Every structure is written in structure tokens, then in C-alpha cells.
Write a protein that binds this ligand. Structure first.
Ligand code: K
Ligand code: MG
Ligand code: MG
Ligand code: MG
Ligand code: MG
Ligand code: MG
Ligand code: NA
Ligand code: NA
Ligand code: NA
Lengths: 47, 50, 141, 113, 128, 154, 105, 77
RNA sequence: GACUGGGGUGGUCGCCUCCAAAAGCGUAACGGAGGCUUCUAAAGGUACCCUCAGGCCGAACCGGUCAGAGUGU
RNA sequence: CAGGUGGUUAUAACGUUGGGGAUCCACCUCUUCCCAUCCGAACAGAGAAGUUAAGCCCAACGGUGCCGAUGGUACUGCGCAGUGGGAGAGUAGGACGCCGCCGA
């Protein structure tokens, strides 16, 4: 139930690869991460 | 101390004994409201016959 | 047969006996005793035979202490079994002793009875033995 | 669990991160049931550089203003001794109340920290 | 209740010196207790008869050749593990004050009596 | 006010009861706090009802108690500085079956009074198991005799 | 409430008084008549004076509740410990008023 | 018959790498350990696997404090 | 397929921990014991604040004497 | 007369007995505001009603802990116990801390 998770919504694009337990967290994981293209912190969401 | 969590209507009430003429005043959470509260064998042989 | 009621490990490495016994070499609990003069593994059968001898002597009088306890498990391979493939079958427990260690103690009997009974016990043991008495003992009464 | 040991554990925790040198001395504070004491300490030498207290200082009746006066006094004493940078030591007290006023007043004075 | 003993002074220490002493049938002994530093000396196996003995013979008067004379009691004895021979003796010097605790033989409810030399506080011996 | 006024006025333990007479009222035994804890293993509405019962009895909210293996297996409430020192005053006019309240101490002074029925409450299967922590220098009984409640064997 | 007993608040006096240990129908009627309270009045409708009269009639006579329970227990204990025929019958659990067993409990 | 044993993991080469009195450059590893057998002191940092390393250049010093606690520090200049 | 106190049969094959290991590191056996092929969106970061387990007394609560507990595995 | 803050690995700790108090520390008094917990118990604030009772400090005590010789023994290096190294435990004893800075 643990799987790869991709965070997206950069600006190319900004991606972060993490892990999560989908049964424990069914809902989409969204976190604020640094965006290298815009040089600021933006909200990334799981695709 | 924590306002709201503690029970409200903590009025002063009087406990009155109806059969002891005793009146007390406290702050029981229940111009004081009044609560009424209520609060051998040889001898037998000699008595029968003697 | 003396052996521990429970044990943490079933098998034990065959260690090495090195010098003289620095503990249990003095007569405490009794008046007469026998000390080993060799280094050996004493088995429960030998201990029980010696105790039976020393108790059949002395009649019912006196008290006998055995001061060693077998708590070292040993194994034997078995006939037709080659070397290797792990430890063999368990074959009881032994007590390792070094010279100076007192094995048997007696109290409450005269000098001659004690000497004879401990001689009888020592004749059933696999080690040469020395008979000893407490140094503050009075020869008479 | 005595309040003394309760504060001693917190004192050890705070000293686990805060230590004072000749530059950036430790500003330690003692509260007590009345008055308030402030000390400037160089820990590598075990030597106090400056001090201030409210024992001979009295202007109001409320400990918050008295603590503010002590903070102003210790800022003055430190700037006279040649101290501009410090590190504050809670000394086992929660940073709120009289000690907060003392530290705020020391900020209004010199002692850029 | 008074043994007499004399001691040859001892100034060599170590396993070699002790072996040399014991080869000629003698025992290294030390004496300590109270004020003053300890005294090292040599006694003889024949000279010690308070060891292989029934009673607690207090008041060993020791005359050490290099030293004065003292009144002590037996404090510690070391035996060989195999031969049961005496290899070292340590004496505790008893004074007027500072009572010393020792073991006194018991007869049936009796004792041997410790009032002089040693002060008091005798524990027991063979309490069976 | 409460019984605190009368207690401070009398203060007869230092002299009339004697003992701890060091000219210090700070040596006089006082009642620190009264704790009422029911406790029950039925959980789950039992705890949510017992909390209400304790709150009604005490006048203050009773938080549930953890059981540490992770459940609300008890309800308790601690009262201080206002428990008639009106809790003691409210408890004084009460009766249940008969008289003969026990006189068991705790080694430092604690009237741990265990009551089976909860129907003796004028406001209200249950239990009471009330306790009275007091700073008795804690005499086992000599300063633990400052109890104005009923007691068996006088 | 009355002798330490909470009565059914919605019942007539001559029935609700029987809920006390030691009072039956006859005793309830007699108690109400001696106290001067009409027997067909609900318990909730009793005046304070009428309740006081009933309680005072219950006192001074009519051993009820814990007193009667203790008296009955004491009588049973004395009967058992005297070692009489009825005492051993009560100790062994058999009828003692002349009833014959082997057919009924 | 057969044996149920025969397994063992690789050795991790733990222990002290720079002893007291030696000269250490910045970033040099001083101790490899499981847990804090030796605790970091002045000018000594501790890593994720409790590896002790030098934050400066100087001489390594081992010291013992209360409860016989062992500290590794660097004396610089 | 290989190892293998001949071969076969049986067991084993990568990683982790202890002992064998001889007070730095390293070190073999079909020597002695056990585990793994994951988990946590908080069981991560930080500020602040707390302190288990056991014995006794009273009846989950009170009291004071005391590293055993926990740290997913 | 007591307070604050440090160095020295308890020879420094714990404990028992006894004594403090103009202020210093503390207990203590009350919750309007800051702030906090079911609970002003803790935390936080408000200024002086009373206490040395407790904390705290001082003195005596070798009681529990802690430290610990000399001598001997175990073990051990030299491929012979000839020549070197030398415990642990135990016994004598020690020890009711020793050095700083600030304030009064
Ligand atoms: K030595
Ligand atoms: Mg390993
Ligand atoms: Mg092959
Ligand atoms: Mg190694
Ligand atoms: Mg090696
Ligand atoms: Mg030693
Ligand atoms: Na191997
Ligand atoms: Na020791
Ligand atoms: Na020793």
C-alpha cells in the first residue's frame, strides 16, 4: 500500500518524488515546496 | 477556571430538613431554592404465665 | 542426577581449565572434606555414586555437602556419524573442576569415620584426591 | 518533584544550547518572589562582567514595571562596560511576564540581540 | 591467651622475593593498624602455632628485629589452594582504645573471654 | 463564606488538640484536595454518562481517565480551595443505609472513603471511591484526626 | 423519603404505603386512618403536614425497614443456634410447619 | 542431519580512527560507533550514524566527566 | 548449478545482529543463536512542556519509598 | 545570617540530630488583566496579611552510598617462571567537599 508519489504544478516543470501509504492517506497529498524555476515556494500536488 | 466547560447555574441553594428544623445554605448546583429532605425467653415466660 | 531445571542455551563450547581453584578451596560448612588434585569433568552419575557411598557409611549420623554442580551440557556424535554437520546428541551435564576444589564435605562424625567415609567416596571419583580437615579442629572431643 | 529540580532540568536544557564568551556574554536572570536580578557572565572565565537588580531600585509597585526598570539599568551597565551583543538565558523560566519585560527593555536599551 | 613471636625484617618485595623466602620454610607477614606505618617481616612455620590450634589465642606479642614490640591479633591468613600451606599472614595491631571485633570459640553458652588487650565486641565462632 | 472561615477562626488543633505547637500555624494540618474517581470497564456510553454524573455531583467538569491499554476506563474530578475548606458541606447532610464509616488511615493521612451506592447523592450500579489528600510532618493519625465526618468506633 | 424509602409517587396512599418493609394492606389502612389522611390520595398530593403525620404514626410503633430486618435476622439466628427441630429444619432447608415432603418442595 | 546456523553479516570496521594527541584536519572522521560511546565536545560534530568528526583543525582530546562519560574534543591553535 | 570430512539424500546460496574473535581493525568451519526482502503524512521539522516500569499502604484514584520501561520491527 | 552563577568524574551524594529570620530566599494571600490546567496543584500575574513549620543555609554524627592503600596472590611478555609487567576481591584507613566571579 506504499507507493511512489509525484508532486507537480511547477512552471519546464518542478517535480518532487516522495512516498506515501495510499490506504492511510487516500486523499491527494499537497505540500508547499521550493520551485527552482520561479525561485520561490509554490504548492505542489500529487498527480 | 476554564469558562464554559464548568457547569453553569451554580446558584446558592438551601437544604431544609422537614423533620429536624435544620436549614443550611450552600452553592449546590441544583433567594435560595429550597430542597426538602426527610433527615428474653425467661421474661416472655414470666409475662405470659408468671 | 543434578542438572539445571532450565537453561538459556542448549549447547556450550568446550572451554579450557587453566590453573588452581581460587574459590571453594577452604572448608566452609563442615569439618572434613576432600579436594581434587586434578582437572576434570565430573559427571552426575559419579557424583551420585560417591554421595551414596559416603551416606551409606557414617550410618544415619552427620551431614554431607556436595559443593560442585554439573551445569555444562555435553554432546556425543554417535556410531557411524562422520565429522561435521553440527553438534551431536546431548548426553547430560558435567561440572569442570581444577586442583584445589573441594568436592565433598562432612560434619558431625569422628575423625576416623569421616576419613573412612571420604576414602570410600573418593574411590568412585575420576580424580586423585586429598583429604583435609579444618585447621582449628580439636583432635579430641 | 520540587520546583527547584523542575527548574534545574530546564536550566540544563537551556545551557545545552546557550553559552557565553567575552564577546556575546550570557545574560542570566533570577526572579524570586520579589525583586529581580540580572547578570552578565563570561562563561569561559567564570567571571561576571556586569550586573543589575531592583534591590536598591524602586519606582512603582508592580513587578512588570520594576523589571522594565531593571532591564533599562542592565542595558546601561552593559553599554558602559562595552557590551553590545549578548545571548539571553531563560534560566529555567518561561519567556513570558516579568522576564519578558526585562528582555524587552534591554532591547529598547542597547544590547542588540 | 598470650602468644610470643619474633620476626626477621623484610625489605624485598615481589613474587621473586616471596618465593625465595618461602623456599627456606618461612612466611611473609605484615602488621598494620592504628597509628604508624605498617611493618613487613618474616616468621617461621614452626614459630606459628596459633594457626593450627583450637582456641582464639589473642595477644600475639611480636618482637620485630628491625622494629619495636607490639601486641596484635590474627587478621588474615592466606593458604595455598592445593598444598594447604601457609603463604602469608597479616596482623592487626590492637591498642588501648578502638575496640577490635574478633571470633571467640563457644563452649556448649560460654566463650574464652576478651576484656584486656582487645576492648569488646566479640562476634561468635562456630555458632552451629 | 465556606467552612474555611470557621476553620481559620478556630484553628484549635495547634493548642486544643495540641501537637505541632511550634508557634507556627504552618504546622497545622490542612486538607489539600478532594478527589472523586469512579472507574468502570464497560467501555461506550458508560463513560459519557458517568462524566455527566460526576460533573453534576461536583459542580465542575470531570475529564475521563485513560487506562494505561488505550480506552476511557474511568472518570475523575479533583476539587480544591472551594470544596468546603462546598463539597464537604454538601456531603455532611447525607445518609446511606446505616452509620459506621470506617477509620482506616493511609500512613500519612488520607480518608479514602469507598461508597458503593451512588443514590446517596441528593442531586443524583455505580461507585464513589472518594479520597481526601491532606498535608497532615505528616502524622499518621495524630494530625489525621482532624476529621469532622462520621467515623465508626467514635 | 418517608423512612428512607422512596415510594411510587403516582399511587394511592393505602397501596403505596405497602412498599415499605413491615407494612401491608391492613397496616397501611390502619396507619392512614390513625394519621387522619384519606386513603385515596396520591403520594404526590400529600401535604407537608400530612406527610409529617404519617411519618410520626410510622414512628412510635410499627417496627419497619432496617429494624425489622435486623429483628428477623436475629430471631432466625437464635432459632438456628438453639439447635431445636425447627432450627435444624431451617439449617437443612426443609419445610418445618408440618408439611410433608417426598411430593412437593 | 543438518545445522540451522551458518549466517553472519559483514563487519562494519567500527572504532576509534584518530586517537588522543593526534592532529586532525577539518572533516576528518574521529570515531565510528553505534550510539554515543563517545560524545561530541568542543569543535566536534556528530553525524546521522553517530560518527564523530572534526569541525576545525587541531589536536584530538579525550576527556572523562561525571558518570565516567567520555567526550571527544578538538583543541585548536 | 555449486558447496559438501567421497558422491547421493537432506540442508544451504544475497543482506542485518550477537558469540566463535585471542582488550585497535580484520579473521574460517554442513561451528552456536536469531532476524530481513519493510514501515511512518507523522513515527518528519521546530518552539514549549512532561517522565516510565516495579514493591508497599488505603479504597482506574491517593501516598511515599524508587532503570527495570519505552525507543514500529 | 542564608541569594545568583561556574569549575573540578559523589573524598563532593544521601541521611539522622540540633539552630535560624531587621532583609535575602522561601512557604504563604487573591485570580481583574497577561497566561494555564477537570483542578491558580504546576505555569502566570497582582504586594505585604503571618510564619522558620517545610524548602534553604549552618553545626555535629562514620550511619547508607563513594573512595581506598601496603603486603600477598591470580594472570602475563621474553619462541621459561631464569629475567621483566602485575590485577580483582578483601583488609588497614579516608571522607559530612575543594577552588572562583557578582550582590547584600
Ligand atoms: K598489589
Ligand atoms: Mg557483526
Ligand atoms: Mg559437486
Ligand atoms: Mg577485535
Ligand atoms: Mg587482539
Ligand atoms: Mg586493589
Ligand atoms: Na562463518
Ligand atoms: Na570497591
Ligand atoms: Na579492594
Amino acid at each position: 500500500l506504499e507507493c511512489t508519489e509525484h508532486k507537480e504544478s511547477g512552471m519546464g516543470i518542478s517535480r518532487y518524488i516522495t512516498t506515501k501509504n495510499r490506504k492511510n492517506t487516500t486523499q491527494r497529498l499537497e505540500l508547499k515546496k521550493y520551485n527552482p524555476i520561479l525561485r520561490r515556494m509554490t504548492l505542489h500536488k500529487e498527480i | 477556571m476554564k469558562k464554559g466547560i464548568h457547569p453553569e447555574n451554580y446558584r446558592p441553594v438551601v437544604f431544609k430538613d422537614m423533620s429536624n428544623e435544620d436549614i443550611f445554605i450552600t452553592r449546590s448546583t441544583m433567594t435560595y431554592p429550597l430542597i426538602k429532605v426527610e433527615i428474653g425467653r425467661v421474661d416472655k415466660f414470666m409475662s405470659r404465665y408468671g | 542426577m543434578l542438572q539445571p531445571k532450565k537453561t538459556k542455551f542448549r549447547r556450550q563450547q568446550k572451554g579450557r581449565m587453566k590453573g588452581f581453584a581460587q574459590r571453594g578451596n577452604q572448608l566452609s560448612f563442615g569439618s572434613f572434606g576432600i579436594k581434587s588434585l586434578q582437572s576434570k569433568w565430573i559427571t552426575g552419575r559419579q557424583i551420585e555414586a560417591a554421595r551414596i557411598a559416603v551416606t551409606r557409611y557414617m550410618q544415619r549420623q552427620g551431614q554431607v555437602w556436595v559443593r560442585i554442580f554439573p551445569d555444562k551440557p555435553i554432546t556425543k556424535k554417535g556410531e557411524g556419524v562422520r565429522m561435521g554437520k553440527g553438534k551431536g546428541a546431548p548426553e547430560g551435564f558435567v561440572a569442570p573442576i581444577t586442583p584445589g576444589r573441594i568436592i565433598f564435605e562432612v560434619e558431625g562424625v569422628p575423625y576416623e569415620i569421616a576419613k573412612e567415609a571420604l576414602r570410600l567416596a573418593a574411590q568412585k571419583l575420576p580424580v586423585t584426591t586429598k583429604f583435609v580437615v579444618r585447621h582449628d579442629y580439636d583432635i579430641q572431643n | 518533584v520540587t520546583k527547584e529540580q523542575r527548574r534545574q532540568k530546564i536550566k540544563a536544557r537551556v545551557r545545552g544550547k546557550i553559552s557565553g564568551t567575552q564577546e556575546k556574554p550570557r545574560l542570566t536572570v533570577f526572579r524570586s518572589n520579589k525583586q529581580i536580578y540580572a547578570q552578565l557572565i563570561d562563561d569561559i572565565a567564570g567571571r561576571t562582567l556586569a550586573s543589575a537588580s531592583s534591590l536598591k531600585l524602586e519606582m512603582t509597585g508592580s513587578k512588570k514595571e520594576i523589571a522594565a526598570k531593571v532591564g533599562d539599568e542592565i542595558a546601561k551597565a552593559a553599554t558602559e562596560a562595552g557590551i553590545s551583543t549578548v545571548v539571553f538565558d531563560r534560566n529555567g523560566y518561561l519567556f513570558h511576564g516579568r522576564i519578558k519585560e526585562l528582555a524587552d527593555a534591554a532591547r529598547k536599551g542597547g544590547l542588540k540581540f | 591467651k598470650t602468644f610470643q613471636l619474633t620476626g626477621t625484617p623484610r625489605a624485598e618485595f615481589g613474587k621473586k622475593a616471596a618465593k625465595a623466602i618461602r623456599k627456606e620454610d618461612q612466611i611473609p607477614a605484615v602488621l598494620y593498624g592504628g597509628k604508624g606505618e605498617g611493618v613487613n617481616f618474616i616468621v617461621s612455620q614452626d614459630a606459628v602455632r596459633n594457626l593450627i590450634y583450637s582456641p582464639e589465642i589473642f595477644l600475639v606479642e611480636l618482637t620485630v628485629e628491625g622494629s619495636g614490640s607490639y601486641k596484635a591479633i590474627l587478621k588474615e591468613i592466606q593458604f595455598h589452594p592445593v598444598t594447604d600451606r601457609i603463604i602469608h599472614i597479616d596482623f592487626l595491631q590492637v591498642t588501648d582504645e578502638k575496640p577490635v571485633v574478633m571470633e571467640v570459640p563457644v563452649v556448649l553458652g560460654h566463650a574464652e573471654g576478651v576484656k584486656a588487650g582487645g576492648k569488646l565486641s566479640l562476634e561468635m565462632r562456630k555458632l552451629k | 463564606t465556606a467552612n474555611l472561615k470557621k476553620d481559620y477562626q478556630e484553628r484549635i488543633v495547634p493548642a486544643l488538640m495540641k501537637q505541632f505547637g511550634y508557634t507556627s500555624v504552618m504546622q497545622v494540618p490542612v486538607l489539600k484536595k478532594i478527589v472523586i474517581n469512579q472507574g468502570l470497564g464497560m467501555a461506550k456510553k458508560i463513560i459519557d454518562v458517568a462524566v455527566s454524573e460526576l460533573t453534576a455531583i461536583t459542580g465542575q467538569k470531570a475529564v475521563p481517565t485513560v487506562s494505561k491499554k488505550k480506552m476511557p476506563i474511568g472518570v475523575m474530578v479533583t476539587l480544591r480551595r472551594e470544596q468546603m475548606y462546598r463539597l464537604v458541606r454538601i456531603a455532611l447532610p447525607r445518609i446511606r443505609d446505616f452509620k459506621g464509616i470506617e477509620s482506616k488511615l493511609d500512613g500519612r493521612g488520607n480518608y479514602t472513603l469507598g461508597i458503593n451506592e451512588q443514590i446517596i447523592f441528593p442531586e443524583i450500579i455505580l461507585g464513589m471511591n472518594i479520597t481526601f489528600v491532606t498535608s497532615a510532618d505528616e502524622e499518621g493519625y495524630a494530625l489525621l484526626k482532624e476529621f469532622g465526618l462520621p467515623f465508626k468506633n467514635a | 423519603r418517608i423512612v428512607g424509602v422512596d415510594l411510587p409517587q403516582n399511587k394511592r396512599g393505602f397501596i403505596a404505603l405497602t412498599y415499605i418493609y413491615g407494612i401491608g394492606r391492613s397496616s397501611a389502612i390502619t396507619i392512614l386512618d390513625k394519621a387522619g389522611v384519606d386513603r385515596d390520595i396520591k403520594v404526590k398530593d400529600w401535604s407537608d403536614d400530612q406527610a409529617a403525620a404519617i411519618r410520626d404514626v410510622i414512628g412510635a410503633g410499627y417496627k419497619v425497614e432496617g429494624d425489622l430486618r435486623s429483628e428477623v435476622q436475629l430471631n432466625i439466628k437464635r432459632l438456628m443456634d438453639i439447635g431445636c427441630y425447627r432450627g435444624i429444619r431451617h439449617r437443612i432447608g426443609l419445610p418445618l410447619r408440618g408439611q410433608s415432603t417426598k411430593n412437593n418442595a | 542431519g543438518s545445522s540451522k546456523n551458518g549466517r553472519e553479516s559483514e563487519s562494519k570496521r567500527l572504532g576509534v580512527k584518530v586517537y588522543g594527541g593526534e592532529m586532525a584536519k577539518a572533516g576528518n572522521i574521529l570515531v565510528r560507533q553505534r550510539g554515543t560511546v563517545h560524545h561530541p565536545g568542543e569543535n566536534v560534530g556528530i553525524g546521522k550514524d553517530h560518527t564523530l568528526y572534526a569541525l576545525k583543525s587541531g589536536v584530538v582530546v579525550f576527556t572523562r566527566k561525571k558518570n565516567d562519560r567520555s567526550y571527544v574534543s578538538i583543541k585548536t591553535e
